[PDB]
Amino acid sequence: MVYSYTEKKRIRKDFGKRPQVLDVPYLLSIQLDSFQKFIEQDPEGQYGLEAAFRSVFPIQSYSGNSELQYVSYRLGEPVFDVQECQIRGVTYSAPLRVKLRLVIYEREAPEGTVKDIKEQEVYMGEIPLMTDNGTFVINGTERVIVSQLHRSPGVFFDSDKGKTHSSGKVLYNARIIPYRGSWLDFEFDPKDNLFVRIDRRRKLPATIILRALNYTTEQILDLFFEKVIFEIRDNKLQMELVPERLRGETASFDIEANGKVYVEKGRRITARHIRQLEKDDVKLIEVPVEYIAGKVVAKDYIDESTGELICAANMELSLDLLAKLSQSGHKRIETLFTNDLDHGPYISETLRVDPTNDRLSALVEIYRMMRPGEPPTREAAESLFENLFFSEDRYDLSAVGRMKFNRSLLREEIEGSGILSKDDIIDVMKKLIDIRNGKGEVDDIDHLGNRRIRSVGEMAENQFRVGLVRVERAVKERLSLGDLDTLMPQDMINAKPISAAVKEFFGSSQLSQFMDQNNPLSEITHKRRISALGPGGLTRERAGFEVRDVHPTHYGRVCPIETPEGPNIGLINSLSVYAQTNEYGFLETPYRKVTDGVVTDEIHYLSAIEEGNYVIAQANSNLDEEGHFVEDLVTCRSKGESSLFSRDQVDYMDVSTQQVVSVGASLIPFLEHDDANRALMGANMQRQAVPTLRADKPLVGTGMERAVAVDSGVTAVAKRGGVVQYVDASRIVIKVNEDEMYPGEAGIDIYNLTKYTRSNQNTCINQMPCVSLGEPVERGDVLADGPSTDLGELALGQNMRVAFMPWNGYNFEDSILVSERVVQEDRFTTIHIQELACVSRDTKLGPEEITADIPNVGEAALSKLDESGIVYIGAEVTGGDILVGKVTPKGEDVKDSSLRVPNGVSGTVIDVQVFTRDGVEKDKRALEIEEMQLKQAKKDLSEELQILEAGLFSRIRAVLVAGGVEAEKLDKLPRDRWLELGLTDEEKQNQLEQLAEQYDELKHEFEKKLEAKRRKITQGDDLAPGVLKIVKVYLAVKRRIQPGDKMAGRHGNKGVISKINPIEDMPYDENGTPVDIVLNPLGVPSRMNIGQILETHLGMAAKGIGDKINAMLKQQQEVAKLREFIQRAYDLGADVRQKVDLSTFSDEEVMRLAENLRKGMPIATPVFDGAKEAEIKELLKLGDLPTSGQIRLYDGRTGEQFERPVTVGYMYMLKLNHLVDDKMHARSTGSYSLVTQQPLGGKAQFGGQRFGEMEVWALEAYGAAYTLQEMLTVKSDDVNGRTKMYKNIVDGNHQMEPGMPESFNVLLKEIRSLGINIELEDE
Amino acid sequence: RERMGHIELASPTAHIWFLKSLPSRIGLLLDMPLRDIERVLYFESYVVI
Amino acid sequence: PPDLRPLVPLDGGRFATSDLNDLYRRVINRNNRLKRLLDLAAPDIIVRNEKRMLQEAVDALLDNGRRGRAITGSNKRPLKSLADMIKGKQGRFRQNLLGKRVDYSGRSVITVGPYLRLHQCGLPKKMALELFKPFIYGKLELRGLATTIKAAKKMVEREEAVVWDILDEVIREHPVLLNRAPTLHRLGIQAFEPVLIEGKAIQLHPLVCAAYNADFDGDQMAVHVPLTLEAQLEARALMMSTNNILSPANGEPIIVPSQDVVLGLYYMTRDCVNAKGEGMVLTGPKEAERLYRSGLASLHARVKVRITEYEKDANGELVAKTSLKDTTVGRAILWMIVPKGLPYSIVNQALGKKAISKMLNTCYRILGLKPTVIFADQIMYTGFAYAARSGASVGIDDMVIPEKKHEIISEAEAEVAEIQEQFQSGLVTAGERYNKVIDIWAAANDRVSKAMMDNLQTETVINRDGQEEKQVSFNSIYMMADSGARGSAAQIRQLAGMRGLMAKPDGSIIETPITANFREGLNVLQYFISTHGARKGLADTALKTANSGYLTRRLVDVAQDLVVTEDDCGTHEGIMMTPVIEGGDV
RNA sequence: UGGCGGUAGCGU
DNA sequence: CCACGCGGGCGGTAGCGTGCTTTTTTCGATCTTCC
DNA sequence: GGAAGATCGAAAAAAGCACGCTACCGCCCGCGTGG
Ligand SMILES: [Mg+2]
């Protein structure tokens, strides 16, 4: 298969045998798709701003015959570019211009024609746009909004686990939850009586709401209960017998009929007896009067002669009541069937408990319950009940909510109204009664089908709707009170509240967080992270054990491995590689349809609910070439259970082996040989790895580093294929091919790299070109790598030739000994960039001015300062130095408030940025920065001008040589002289003029563009109120490896550096090569990270291959032998999916590949379709290294020989962002707090360590008591004690004055500030 | 740090620690329900002296 | 008082807002408005509302949010009144009163240092310079190098050599206290005699790490410096780690050799059969060391040496007995550091972790603490050195999978198939089928583990001047397993046997087990099943930390008062004591 | 050389 | 037409509403034992 | 002979929720009157 030009440079030897049927999709698909849906026009609405506009608008002005309605909306072009927004420090936003139409209907006529129609486009705020990178730019900072995971709206029929009642009886509750509105619960009590709870208030009898729904007691009785007819006709009391109604009831009489004794008195009913009844199917059976005693009568029977009712509805029958019915003459008695288990009479008892008897009484009770302390009003109760449940604006079930509501109740109709109907409540309570009766099963909240993910678009739409109703109230009241004439619709709508709400959501929400730019994997994981926190979600501390478990439905959607350890475990997860989102919002996973025995290539996206019905095959299940399963009995998943199934009864197969793990966890090689905890925390530390100044390719990889690098925006991916024209460390110029220029276009692509830009974690973000001049490129190929990227491949750390053996106890436990050669090559040195800010705020006493001369300051310190007052670029200032000279007006000269370098900080100043408010006089360095930016813009414009002018002058030259045919005179003459050249009077002159005018138009247009760019650069930036000039200085420093630094491998091994041992003490092999890093094997057997060893072995093999290649490069061998060796190396393996053909590559391509492979051949091993040990042994045999993986090391310290062979090999190791220099802090006599006179806290504030309460407990545990008094009073907060201690220590006397702590005095004074009289007794 | 001042309230006011910290000291001493004491205190209900 | 609610001067003309100041301003405004209304004789309704809202302001000031809504501010969140920050976790009573930040303190990440004695710790030069600054100032003033404190400060920031010499003199016997952030038990904080070292990390003694429960994976130590003489004597007497030898919970020793140390001792006590130098007769451990260092013999060789054992008799005198014993050369080397009180039988074993602990306990009981500390330092040194010389390593070839295992699995499958067939025929129910499946798989797991252990323990076969013979294997993983340095039988079973029967999060055992070793590949389903238990345990610990801390705090508060005040009560009443028997075992 | 709250993350 | 001031709450005919657990108090409703 | 003491059960309120460390965001403020 044809390889891209960026891939031909280095081809990764990939193991694995399972072919891929679906390539890795766009990792950032969720965010981009959500925002595209949110910000695009939708003809059918129901998505984004269109849905909110249609739901909110129009607004009726309190029956004022005047409303305004939505017409259209448009998103304006952003004022500033993404790079411009980042540099300037403003929010990347776009205007929201909405064309609206206010109409004033004719007064005195409800249907009269509109008198005036005012239609206009109103600027209703600005909304933040999202970049291609998948991140938002708020206030000049890159923030990311994670996707929340919340319970889907609808009906959840669950139950308590049974411990609440303490008697072993469970209680079932159905909770109807809306997208917006009040929640409604129907719960069973220990007394088997239904109850209704609204918004977690005091419970009420369940029939109260039924009465409020204008349902009579007879209506409820016949709705929620079956009916039995008793006939006292023929003096036999014959009743309509249903054979299923007689199941499981002991006979209280003789039920013989038609001369057949089915079952007699004293005999419990048997299934054969019920069968005999079915065969006889007798309509009516004679009954004694005693049998119908406890049956409740559904119909409130009334005697027509007397005019009074014999018995009320739902009343238990009585012998006197039966006699009254008999003497009344009624023969058709109605009873409610009450089975002990099949049909529980809960509704009848609930109605009996209900005190309310009419709709008005029930509504009054509801009003009292919802609004305690207020007198009941019929109209008020009606309004409250209608608004609570049956109002469109208050209560609104979402489309997903309605779908879940109908699916749970098997309504079969997916579409429905947002409001809740009476039939919905009826069906919900009927299903709850069915669950109580013993049929049906309760749902599981932890099931992934009952939880949905809300992306950025949905939350943005909700916040927009909240702002819309907030401004809707204002426009409603303004239209209601004000006269509608000459009213210009701009001033009804005020954009301040909506804009404030949008800004608050995008800059201070619970889920909008600063992204971590440590390495591209970090941004990818942060953009693909799903959290359960935020509004409408769980709390960090009151989460519960059940919600932090992994459900069997998490397969293929949520990675069981990647999860932040700590209080957030379980609550935060990472999306799977192939997982995507359904339209309703539920996670879905790809699957391969299995037809007959052959697995086809068709891909179906199965959701969580529907996956539980079919039988899912296994990714690792063996498959033949035809497609059948070579094994009849294959492992499969069905109904959330893993079991063996036959060949015929399987319907779907996994798309790929790596379908389960996330993007972050999939980058761990040999993951199947690692423990879950070890792998989890190894991926966690892989997320945090600072970029080194030289990125080195990982020798052992999983193959998706290319995809991760390409999808992440750190690289510079070309948009159009072509040939490089001008390559440089700053800019790249691409001359696109003949197929890919739009008409009237230069065809020149200018890619501007970012060099040494600060990240969100004070880490370097540098871009280095990888292509060479004249190298052809195609669209999608990488042009310049970013941080931790090498040739378009993710490179978090470095390949170290490590060994596993104890070394004098320096690697006592999990501690790493690093050779001094690592420091020599600076393989782990990292650049850190810090930013300091100085604000020239304007005070009432006077403004602040940045000057060079400062009162009473050393002139030596002013040397670093310039005439403008800012430090020169490239200075080597250290701790205590001054960067910007600022003075502030004093009371009734100027006080020196100039920004100074924080103590313990040094480095080199790389750049300075200045922001100036409009009207404030520009500074000199501001002019220099503006002219530099203008020069860069003019250089780009001239890069376009040269090609455009060359084309135009070539055309005029063709015209001239066609007409004049003085080629020699033309070429000697300048092109400007060609322009003024005249010819004979025909098209030779007409077309010449028509081309000269186009040249002039092009020049004028490009001058206009230059003027626009100059205006954009020159325009002053907006600042905070009271601020005049802001100066930001960026320093940078190289941090090298020092003892105490934390270095961890990919597989999970952690630790800190113990000693920078000189290279002469390292163990050396027979060839004399140093063994570099030495680890401790003791951590291997316990913490299962065996994938280390294999990887190490594999790494060694890889290096050996590279070694061989390097040899063939050093001896100047011909291309034939190199090609043969590379082909043999690539062909190694058994049934590998990769088929690299070296013959098709040219000699130059083969030489380039060999040059790039001289430092070892990168190896790709899939997560679960990895390379077996046999392949590793064969690769080691190819490299002539021993197949056991262990060599004989010689000690360098003593020169002896180790008794046993040790394991050595090349392992990938990272550098954690846990440096030691920024963690050490020490204080002797620092500052103190104003209120407690106690030492401060934090390294940045030069504070002191906190003596915790357990420290005091331990001090009391020992017999030390003077040390406690030292910790408590003298050294912390006794100011007299502190001064006396300092003076005595200076004098040398180590004597103590106890004193009185000031914190106790503070507490005494504050308690006395209340009504308490805490004081001191004189004795 | 050890100097305090006094605010002269125009009308008497109840201390809240002795009122809301169950059991209510004011209510226990007066032998009246807490709700009645709260209603009387917050200038909405009248009490006979 | 005004200083207790200060108006912090923010950058520029802005002043930091104080909640107490806002509440007091509200109360004063309300009182002034009420006074004005009363003076003007306002209608009863207006003054009534004014009094009610004054009462609400008093509610806000005294205890915000106690009655109803808490009065908020510009932050849209409840403000802090007196009561809220008097109480609570962040309240003045338990945040700045019961535990407070102190001066002369520092913190830094730690690293292991082997060349350090039991009573010593490694302090960075910068940390020692900063922490002991007043002592250096005083010593410089006494020396006359600096006339005033300012001159001493300038000399310190200039970093001459005289300041380094003064610092070295100061630290000579000034102990410093080191502690961990989660100090749980009594041994959480201990003092050491610091020594100046390079680098930027605190070097810590390896043996005491188990006392701190602090692995060298990025943990940070906190250091405090006593000044007064009483505090220094507390450091030398009770803060000292040497005095802390027995745990206060059960009396067992707290310091215990572990990890590489014991591993080295294991390699110094295992005996081969045909090792170089077998049959040699030596006169003493010195000649054994000579032979080993010269390369003429191996540590596992079996020889006969003349040992002069010193034993304690009546009146505590030492009696020397010389005998030609049979042992290994490594044991002879180990005998060099053994003091003159222990018998030779304490060394003539395989020297496991428990053997080392028993030897240390016997040494402490017989010869006392002072020889015991030196003996512990010596055994640490010897174990580290000989573990380095051993060159023990873990490799993929060291991981031997028993040959029968696959066959066993096959038969197990056959068995389960038969049982499954019964459930197809209706002979047995689903529950009994599942129970029999679980029992069969457990039996298969036990058989596989036994076969793997038999394979690993005695795999090595060696010629001994003739026919082949068996001996305890030299496989590295078996060394770590038997010596007890790190790992257990269950972990080695998971490693080279089978993972076992995993469990669903609810607690139910999965019907099928994980039949693949960690050495070989694991399919997706088995990894997914294991993730359930992994997440279960991780979440268990995460939620366990907080409850453990709360229980510890409550227990500490309950028993804070109890101290020993008298010698003997004279009471004749006491509790009964009998061995606890639950039935079938004691 | 001015620290008070809040938010997020890290190590046990 | 700016500086003090004031009270500071969003949301809405008000009420603070949502998958923790334990302890204490209160209050209404009922069961029961006597004046 | 049917009310007052005792009980019960549900509701409502209070109280806490391990320890260190790191980073950043808001510490005014917006609407209503008197010179
Ligand atoms: Mg640790």
PDB file of C-alpha atoms in Angstrom, chain A residues 331-426:
ATOM      1  CA  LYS A 331     -78.687  -7.679  41.661  1.00  0.00           C
ATOM      2  CA  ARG A 332     -75.447  -6.644  39.890  1.00  0.00           C
ATOM      3  CA  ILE A 333     -72.896  -6.129  42.668  1.00  0.00           C
ATOM      4  CA  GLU A 334     -69.439  -4.829  41.750  1.00  0.00           C
ATOM      5  CA  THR A 335     -66.308  -5.966  43.587  1.00  0.00           C
ATOM      6  CA  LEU A 336     -62.597  -5.270  43.187  1.00  0.00           C
ATOM      7  CA  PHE A 337     -60.394  -8.326  42.713  1.00  0.00           C
ATOM      8  CA  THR A 338     -57.719  -8.369  45.437  1.00  0.00           C
ATOM      9  CA  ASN A 339     -55.134 -11.111  44.992  1.00  0.00           C
ATOM     10  CA  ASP A 340     -52.635 -11.577  47.808  1.00  0.00           C
ATOM     11  CA  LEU A 341     -49.670 -11.390  45.413  1.00  0.00           C
ATOM     12  CA  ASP A 342     -50.903 -11.036  41.821  1.00  0.00           C
ATOM     13  CA  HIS A 343     -52.985  -7.863  42.360  1.00  0.00           C
ATOM     14  CA  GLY A 344     -52.124  -5.994  45.549  1.00  0.00           C
ATOM     15  CA  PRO A 345     -54.873  -3.709  46.845  1.00  0.00           C
ATOM     16  CA  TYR A 346     -52.480  -0.818  47.476  1.00  0.00           C
ATOM     17  CA  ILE A 347     -54.615   1.708  45.577  1.00  0.00           C
ATOM     18  CA  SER A 348     -57.689   1.001  47.715  1.00  0.00           C
ATOM     19  CA  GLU A 349     -55.782   1.525  50.966  1.00  0.00           C
ATOM     20  CA  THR A 350     -54.135   4.674  49.598  1.00  0.00           C
ATOM     21  CA  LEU A 351     -57.569   6.047  48.694  1.00  0.00           C
ATOM     22  CA  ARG A 352     -58.823   5.150  52.176  1.00  0.00           C
ATOM     23  CA  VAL A 353     -55.972   7.111  53.777  1.00  0.00           C
ATOM     24  CA  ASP A 354     -56.672  10.066  51.460  1.00  0.00           C
ATOM     25  CA  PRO A 355     -58.638  12.748  53.371  1.00  0.00           C
ATOM     26  CA  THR A 356     -59.546  14.778  50.288  1.00  0.00           C
ATOM     27  CA  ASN A 357     -62.809  13.839  48.575  1.00  0.00           C
ATOM     28  CA  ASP A 358     -63.111  16.396  45.745  1.00  0.00           C
ATOM     29  CA  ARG A 359     -60.972  18.206  43.193  1.00  0.00           C
ATOM     30  CA  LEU A 360     -61.101  21.443  45.196  1.00  0.00           C
ATOM     31  CA  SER A 361     -59.993  19.712  48.405  1.00  0.00           C
ATOM     32  CA  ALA A 362     -57.106  17.949  46.657  1.00  0.00           C
ATOM     33  CA  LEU A 363     -56.002  21.199  45.011  1.00  0.00           C
ATOM     34  CA  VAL A 364     -56.169  23.012  48.363  1.00  0.00           C
ATOM     35  CA  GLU A 365     -54.037  20.284  49.949  1.00  0.00           C
ATOM     36  CA  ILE A 366     -51.522  20.509  47.091  1.00  0.00           C
ATOM     37  CA  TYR A 367     -51.360  24.299  47.448  1.00  0.00           C
ATOM     38  CA  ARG A 368     -50.803  24.012  51.204  1.00  0.00           C
ATOM     39  CA  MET A 369     -48.078  21.393  50.737  1.00  0.00           C
ATOM     40  CA  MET A 370     -46.242  23.294  47.990  1.00  0.00           C
ATOM     41  CA  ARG A 371     -46.771  26.712  49.630  1.00  0.00           C
ATOM     42  CA  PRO A 372     -46.939  26.284  53.415  1.00  0.00           C
ATOM     43  CA  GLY A 373     -48.105  29.181  55.549  1.00  0.00           C
ATOM     44  CA  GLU A 374     -50.361  30.710  52.891  1.00  0.00           C
ATOM     45  CA  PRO A 375     -54.182  30.622  52.888  1.00  0.00           C
ATOM     46  CA  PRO A 376     -55.561  28.397  50.120  1.00  0.00           C
ATOM     47  CA  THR A 377     -57.226  29.957  47.087  1.00  0.00           C
ATOM     48  CA  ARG A 378     -59.020  27.984  44.383  1.00  0.00           C
ATOM     49  CA  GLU A 379     -57.639  30.074  41.516  1.00  0.00           C
ATOM     50  CA  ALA A 380     -54.169  30.135  43.084  1.00  0.00           C
ATOM     51  CA  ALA A 381     -54.242  26.356  43.563  1.00  0.00           C
ATOM     52  CA  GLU A 382     -55.360  25.850  39.957  1.00  0.00           C
ATOM     53  CA  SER A 383     -52.582  28.110  38.671  1.00  0.00           C
ATOM     54  CA  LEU A 384     -49.952  26.406  40.837  1.00  0.00           C
ATOM     55  CA  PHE A 385     -51.006  22.918  39.736  1.00  0.00           C
ATOM     56  CA  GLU A 386     -51.123  23.922  36.066  1.00  0.00           C
ATOM     57  CA  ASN A 387     -47.703  25.589  36.221  1.00  0.00           C
ATOM     58  CA  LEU A 388     -46.042  22.810  38.227  1.00  0.00           C
ATOM     59  CA  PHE A 389     -46.742  19.982  35.767  1.00  0.00           C
ATOM     60  CA  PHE A 390     -48.883  21.029  32.787  1.00  0.00           C
ATOM     61  CA  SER A 391     -47.122  24.288  31.851  1.00  0.00           C
ATOM     62  CA  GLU A 392     -44.902  24.317  28.777  1.00  0.00           C
ATOM     63  CA  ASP A 393     -42.361  26.878  30.000  1.00  0.00           C
ATOM     64  CA  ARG A 394     -42.044  25.579  33.574  1.00  0.00           C
ATOM     65  CA  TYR A 395     -42.063  21.803  33.015  1.00  0.00           C
ATOM     66  CA  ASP A 396     -40.453  20.572  29.795  1.00  0.00           C
ATOM     67  CA  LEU A 397     -39.319  17.002  29.183  1.00  0.00           C
ATOM     68  CA  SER A 398     -36.575  16.905  26.567  1.00  0.00           C
ATOM     69  CA  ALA A 399     -36.795  14.863  23.376  1.00  0.00           C
ATOM     70  CA  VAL A 400     -34.399  12.318  24.880  1.00  0.00           C
ATOM     71  CA  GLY A 401     -36.512  12.488  28.030  1.00  0.00           C
ATOM     72  CA  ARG A 402     -39.689  11.733  26.086  1.00  0.00           C
ATOM     73  CA  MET A 403     -37.945   8.914  24.215  1.00  0.00           C
ATOM     74  CA  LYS A 404     -36.834   7.327  27.496  1.00  0.00           C
ATOM     75  CA  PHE A 405     -40.308   7.870  28.974  1.00  0.00           C
ATOM     76  CA  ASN A 406     -41.948   6.031  26.080  1.00  0.00           C
ATOM     77  CA  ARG A 407     -39.303   3.291  25.899  1.00  0.00           C
ATOM     78  CA  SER A 408     -39.573   2.464  29.607  1.00  0.00           C
ATOM     79  CA  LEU A 409     -43.378   2.264  29.404  1.00  0.00           C
ATOM     80  CA  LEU A 410     -43.317   0.509  25.990  1.00  0.00           C
ATOM     81  CA  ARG A 411     -45.452   3.232  24.412  1.00  0.00           C
ATOM     82  CA  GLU A 412     -43.741   2.436  21.067  1.00  0.00           C
ATOM     83  CA  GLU A 413     -44.107   6.103  20.048  1.00  0.00           C
ATOM     84  CA  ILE A 414     -40.766   7.915  20.141  1.00  0.00           C
ATOM     85  CA  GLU A 415     -42.135  11.436  19.550  1.00  0.00           C
ATOM     86  CA  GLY A 416     -44.259  13.229  22.124  1.00  0.00           C
ATOM     87  CA  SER A 417     -45.048  16.520  23.790  1.00  0.00           C
ATOM     88  CA  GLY A 418     -42.616  18.051  26.251  1.00  0.00           C
ATOM     89  CA  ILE A 419     -45.347  18.601  28.837  1.00  0.00           C
ATOM     90  CA  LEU A 420     -46.487  15.708  31.020  1.00  0.00           C
ATOM     91  CA  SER A 421     -49.977  14.308  30.440  1.00  0.00           C
ATOM     92  CA  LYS A 422     -52.474  12.535  32.682  1.00  0.00           C
ATOM     93  CA  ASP A 423     -52.078   9.246  30.806  1.00  0.00           C
ATOM     94  CA  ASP A 424     -48.324   9.402  31.433  1.00  0.00           C
ATOM     95  CA  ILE A 425     -48.871   9.521  35.204  1.00  0.00           C
ATOM     96  CA  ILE A 426     -51.518   6.791  34.975  1.00  0.00           C
TER      97      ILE A 426
END
